[model samples]
Target: SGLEVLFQGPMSLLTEVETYVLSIVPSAPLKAEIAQRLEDVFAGKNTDLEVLMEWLKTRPILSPLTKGILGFVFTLTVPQRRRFVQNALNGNGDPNNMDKAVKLYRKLKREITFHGAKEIALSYSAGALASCMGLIYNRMGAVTTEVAFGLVCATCEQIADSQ
Candidate 1:
């Protein structure tokens, strides 16, 4: 919510942070360390504000879009990734394998979308995903599009929700 308030307007607070950080060190080892440390910190206490700010001390913060991508990608896994690929390649979606498709959708979550801002307020449900066209249409005001993509999370991160 705080982030939403900060990014509510145009230009984006993220862009500001990105420009600020990238401008400072550019491609310094400091930035690499920051990203690595961020990944490290993300693993433990979840979202710790202090550790995050400390991690942000170095490195280019990146665009909100980039951050969105990071947020999604940094949490994906191998099977989850394969599910996505299989879905795209086979959007035909075998009825028998609908469970796999749905599983992939939830596992991938907001990470995969051909267009528009992908927002899953909850885990994937057939009814929920069915309404995606509506969600995308609602955000169509920005015809320019907002894409999210890149490397998925590691295999170890792909645990069933039951875990």
Candidate 2:
């Protein structure tokens, strides 16, 4: 059987990330909660990270990794944020530009080239993301999951090292 099109390329960080959390999150209710927040963010309502911070605070019990993924989303540069939303909304992501995915992976990971973050890495949220992307890339092809999350975690640190 042809593998299911788990995802098509030019996928936004939104599609990439939202699917990962929904898959790993335990309760349907919590998934719904997260889903709602994602909707708000995608709609440009989450202009400030506090909206999401409070959302996470209310959840209070979100897995640390989940928090980190959203954290990366929260701290994204406006240019990055708006572009993804625009691409996703307008179907602007060029499908053949699967190369964009690698570029994104490169930029996102490029931030972690510091000393402190290296000590604090492991990955999972991205394992499933990449697993799915690999099929799309064959289209092509993490921590380990902890480092994926770790890569995500340093996103704020990505700020000081800002692009």
Candidate 3:
């Protein structure tokens, strides 16, 4: 909810992000491919995040970075679920149990910042990646960075919830 409040309005900022990516890449073929892919992913009738996630995982012509962005987007949109042990531990409701919570909170905070920073890098690095492999590989690096950060966020949230 806090993240929602922080990022409210213009959920379509992703469109701008896509537009920015288009402007960054100079090749017409790559541009057309990415444009169509985004349209299919975001504009199609299916609204389920799980479906979106699967599409991204299997989407053609995308670098690993794009795939990571897919998961990050899905993770950000989905409800966070903690482990059963975390809930069981929480029953005690004591400060001693809070140590894990504190660590998890810090981890979550770190991943959130990490994700934001990597996304910014991914968005801005488009122009620099104009070559054949350059475009895909560089963007892949950017998106993969996000994937790693998103994984951390997922892990931290799970641990925090379990606590």
Candidate 4:
């Protein structure tokens, strides 16, 4: 309870989180390449696809909240991540796994809410996006959001399968 103070306060924590979320561009292939490469001292072979990350983030249609979630997932230790997967296997879950699962779900949900708040606020706060594209912009935002999550699950599932 005492150390939770570090997680408190809004402006500083909020600013730090905003930047942390933005810094990670969710290129699944690149993420695999980088996380694996750095994790393995051997520089294990992959392919020419490794260069794709450098080119990926430049494109639009990427959502900040999606990256926020993905980044947080990656931020966990491998054991934590593996435990998360087994917890998802719920039939096998012990109270420990169940507790950890719902506990982290709250953290993730908080991030989604926090990240979405700033972005949605800034868009409306800018005042033009509200009056701007009207339908297509809103439509694209919605569709791309689900697409991002689907793509993310596929990425993490590939990861989960191996471990």
Candidate 5:
């Protein structure tokens, strides 16, 4: 439903993004500039993936460094992460668990984007996180788990170093 909300209005989506980024960066001028730039870039296009991807070509408003750090920190926060993991572990094969999983994942994905990250960073980081969680949930062997741990560590480190 929120995803539907996300795709409803280009201006509203960008407005939301501006508000969120302003909350973090605290610059009214910057927020105005971002909204203006996004309006120009979108040019009244629909807020679908196709239009959003095209707008991204002009670098509307995303800071890879800022969002990457935010994503990393946000992902580690206990409440949502723990809740998702617990639901994933303890659910009796219910779709609600999966629904919440997707919702939480998309929430993080959207946040990372709004905070100024490129698509690749979101994809790589989210995928790495998913893999790590999957391995743990499946009760992988020690060696496998260690490898997954190492993978997450290395990927986050790489993102940090590069950004």
Candidate 6:
């Protein structure tokens, strides 16, 4: 019998991060608390950053302010947030998950850039996203600006030719 392998990209990260988030913060209240905070920010009660700060204060393991600062990096619109979660849930854009997954991929690519992950510098960012997140990420990276437009062009050509 031959072995079959599967690739699950950022879920690996999310699983790792969720462990960190859960270990540092209480698990039961984190999602609801954070969601409510995001909802409040969306409703104009406070800046998204401010809502994240309040949410962070609930966790005692880390310094409240420090966690808040990190939380700022994760805040996004509900659709965007869902997209990120969906991407972590499923690497490819399952039709039911495409909308959110694409949104997540876009935000994630930006985050990767934001954090200065030199492994995926601007040179081939679009192809990188496309290869990682599938068509949803490909489309988003294509329509929106990417690190290198020419790389995406070549990537699409290769993907198309292979099919």
lDDT (0 to 1) per candidate: 0.31, 0.40, 0.38, 0.32, 0.37, 0.36
In angstroms, how far off is 80's CA in candidate 2? 17
Question: How well is each residue in 40-153 modelled by candidate 5, as lDDT tens digits?
Answer: 433543334333333333443544423332232222221112333323222234435444434433433333222232222244443344433343334323223223223334
Please report how far candidate 4 places residue 86 from its true position, in Å. Answer: 14
Quantify how close model 5 is to the true structure by its C-alpha RMSD in Å.
16.6
Estimate the TM-score of every prediction.
0.23, 0.39, 0.31, 0.20, 0.23, 0.26
Lowest-sum lDDT 10-residue window in model 4: 125-134
lDDT for each residue of candidate 3 in 1-163, tens digit (9 for 90 to 100): 8887665433344454345434433354555755675555544434566655566556566545344433443343332222221222231234443444333333333443444633433322121211111222223333333433433233323333333
What's the lDDT for candidate 4?
Answer: 0.32
- Find the candidate with the highest lDDT and give its number: 2
Q: Taking the tens digit of each residue's C-alpha lDDT, what string does model 1 give over 4-62?
A: 67655433422332332233233556567645544453334356443343333332544
For model 6, the run of ten residues with the poorest summed lDDT: 77-86
Any runs in candidate 5 off by more than 4 Å, and if so which? 1-14, 28-31, 42-163
Predictions: Cα RMSD each: 15.0, 15.3, 15.8, 17.4, 16.6, 16.6
Q: How many residue pairs clash in each candidate?
A: 1, 9, 3, 0, 2, 1
- How much is 88 displaced in model 2, in angstroms? 29
lDDT of 3 at 116: 62
lDDT of 6 at 48: 51
Distance from true location, Cα of 45 in model 6, Å: 18
User: Considering only N, C-alpha and C atoms within 3 Å, which residue pairs clash in candidate 4?
Assistant: none
Candidate number with the higher lDDT (1 or 5)? 5
- Candidate that would win on TM-score: 2
Q: Alpha-carbon error at 159 in model 4, in Å?
A: 4.9
Residue pairs in clash, model 5 = 62-116, 63-116
Ranking by TM-score: 2, 3, 6, 1, 5, 4
